[PDB]
Design a protein around this ligand. Structure first.
Ligand SMILES: *[C@@H]1O[C@H](CO[C@@H]2O[C@@H](C)[C@@H](O)[C@@H](O)[C@@H]2O)[C@@H](O[C@@H]2O[C@H](CO)[C@@H](O[C@@H]3O[C@H](CO[C@H]4O[C@H](CO)[C@@H](O)[C@H](O)[C@@H]4O)[C@@H](O)[C@H](O[C@H]4O[C@H](CO)[C@@H](O)[C@H](O)[C@@H]4O)[C@@H]3O)[C@H](O)[C@H]2NC(C)=O)[C@H](O)[C@H]1NC(C)=O
Ligand SMILES: *[C@@H]1O[C@H](CO[C@@H]2O[C@@H](C)[C@@H](O)[C@@H](O)[C@@H]2O)[C@@H](O[C@@H]2O[C@H](CO)[C@@H](O[C@@H]3O[C@H](CO[C@H]4O[C@H](CO)[C@@H](O)[C@H](O)[C@@H]4O)[C@@H](O)[C@H](O[C@H]4O[C@H](CO)[C@@H](O)[C@H](O)[C@@H]4O)[C@@H]3O)[C@H](O)[C@H]2NC(C)=O)[C@H](O)[C@H]1NC(C)=O
Lengths: 95, 95
């Protein structure tokens, strides 16, 4: 029934969380294509540091490549590869 | 190396995602205690519907109870149980 404190505390603490990002936020200069899916799951830092002096920030990043469908209205659809930034490691660091 | 389209498409599609929420957003009337952890992991609907006419919304919800530390500055700390709303099922429904 009840989630124990140690489990809550660990699961909430700053780390990379699977985060759903709109592709246009990552590719805001795209003006020719619609994408499917319109969002992608990326690991990005989040959670809490329990210290107003610290913020959760990435300390290691990398790209992940995904197949995404690009649609040109009434002209066709194609699968292409697009890379997105992910966070591999996060830490609570002084603001 | 490359995440295949079917995998991207399924993982991004509307469903409950573990989401880190500040406890004061859920308990905005709290004026006496600091909480540790300051945020909690809750399943909440998110992701995409790939249709401008649809939005991802919860269709079934429940509470989850977690042990959270409440701190009264310089007067002590105690573990208490606090419930949070989670989303069990999500669907893409007409806006
Ligand atoms: C993740 O992958 C990125 C490449 O991804 C591919 O290409 C993109 C466009 C998509 O198609 C994707 O689907 C592909 O898989 C890769 O990007 C590289 O990022 C670095 C920065 O981290 C860029 O170097 C810096 O460029 C800027 C200027 O940026 C503009 O101009 C360049 C052309 O020169 C373009 O290529 C850019 O995209 C922008 O249009 C410079 O200002 C900067 O110099 C300054 O910063 C460095 C420190 O980083 C200092 O040492 C310098 O002295 C300056 O202070 C860099 O030169 C690089 O251009 C970019 N490449 C490409 C092809 O876009 C990224 O690195 C990958 N990340 C990881 C973690 O692997
Ligand atoms: C999840 O758990 C909730 C209870 O959680 C516990 O209590 C809270 C405060 C924390 O301490 C937590 O850690 C505990 O574990 C449970 O909450 C219940 O929610 C329902 C609504 O879903 C409430 O009923 C509605 O009340 C409102 C008025 O709300 C205020 O007044 C009441 C006092 O009457 C308080 O109890 C509230 O908290 C607010 O201060 C009414 O307007 C409403 O009537 C209208 O809506 C219904 C349809 O829902 C119609 O049929 C009516 O005719 C009206 O149109 C309801 O009466 C209930 O008060 C609240 N209980 C408590 C103890 O707060 C929640 O239901 C749980 N969720 C699930 C999915 O299980």
């Amino acid at each position: 029934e009840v989630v124990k404190f140690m489990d809550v505390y660990q699961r909430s603490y700053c780390h990379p969380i699977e985060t759903l990002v709109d592709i246009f936020q990552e590719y805001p200069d795209e003006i020719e294509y619609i994408f499917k899916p319109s969002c992608v799951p990326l690991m990005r830092c989040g959670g809490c540091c329990n210290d107003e002096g610290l913020e959760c920030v990435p300390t290691e990043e990398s790209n992940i490549t995904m197949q995404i469908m690009r649609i040109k209205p009434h002209q066709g659809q194609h699968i292409g590869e697009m890379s997105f930034l992910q966070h591999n490691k996060c830490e609570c660091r002084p603001k």
